[PDB]
């Protein structure tokens, strides 16, 4: 209802979101960031990107019988970033190895033939300052592909070679 | 040298904009905010609302003869910053006593009626800490109505009504 925080992010309940059950928590500031793609439905505007959100956390709640959607942070092609577990709630992105020790953000769509627009690319960037700024993420964070973490596609071939050029990325 | 940016904005070059004619700059930090209304269509996408910032910007240039759209940065229904003169550059939407000691801050659309979703008004809100990140604007900053420095509806009533309530508003 009464968001004032960075990186103009879509709250939960702007998104419709079902209630969050999770209890495990991040040990802060996290090192490290793990980039996925949803494999899901693209989404290019915030009613479509809102929807697209409902429905990752429908399937991994009704579906999977987690607590909540699995990612820290969705990213849609709106340009908009969309809450999940946040920065203090471990998430379920990365397996039992790296969802304890890093952040995990989820653009909206398969991006192994797509390539993401400019703007999500940088609600993205904007994302991480904003969470280093919070002490959430350690100034000196570190950023992996899905893929660098688990045997996946994600977060496309297409988005991976994005993040490889970022200046905090390490493979 | 100056290290990492604030805010995610939709730059010039990506809405299509024209390129400025404008010299004049404003003395940095900058006191004073002003909210405005375009008293035009709304857009609730990135890509109706980079084409709204075009017809803004060629009105002022083209038929009123600025060097650029007057303000300062652009707000979206679809929950995007869009630049116009950006931070360093006196811009053209609050006359003569204001235009060189303000930033101007117009939402795309007329708010006499309508109410601006939470988005757009999280994203204004966010543009202006970002202000004072990088010491465009003071700490200390004051944001302004349009209607508190003209005579004139704008931003718009319900849009006015908002905007009082925000922390740095004073009459």
């Known amino acids: 209802e009464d968001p004032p925080a960075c990186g103009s992010i879509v709250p939960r309940r702007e998104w419709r979101a079902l209630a969050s059950e999770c209890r495990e928590r991040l040990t802060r500031p996290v090192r490290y960031v793990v980039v996925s793609h949803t494999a899901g439905s693209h989404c290019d505007t915030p009613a479509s990107c809102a929807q697209?959100?409902?429905?990752?956390?429908?399937?991994?709640?009704?579906?999977?019988?987690?607590?909540?959607?699995?990612?820290?942070?969705?990213?849609?092609?709106?340009?908009?970033?969309?809450?999940?577990?946040?920065?203090?709630?471990?998430?379920?992105?990365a397996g039992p190895t790296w969802?304890?020790?890093?952040?995990?953000?989820?653009?909206?769509?398969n991006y192994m033939n797509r390539?993401?627009?400019?703007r999500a690319l940088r609600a993205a960037q904007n994302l991480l300052a904003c969470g280093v700024a919070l002490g959430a993420l350690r100034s000196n964070y570190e950023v992996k592909g899905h893929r660098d973490v688990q045997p996946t596609l994600?977060?496309?071939?297409?988005?991976?070679?994005?993040?490889?050029?970022?200046?905090?990325?390490?493979?």
């Open 52 to 93: 697209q959100a409902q429905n990752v956390q429908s399937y991994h709640v009704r579906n999977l019988g987690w607590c909540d959607v699995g990612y820290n942070f969705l990213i849609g092609e709106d340009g908009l970033v969309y809450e999940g577990r946040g920065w203090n709630i471990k998430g379920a992105h």
């Open 99 to 109: 969802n304890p020790i890093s952040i995990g953000i989820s653009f909206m769509g």
């Open 115 to 118: 390539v993401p627009p400019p």
């Open 154 to 171: 994600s977060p496309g071939d297409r988005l991976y070679e994005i993040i490889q050029t970022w200046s905090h990325y390490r493979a």
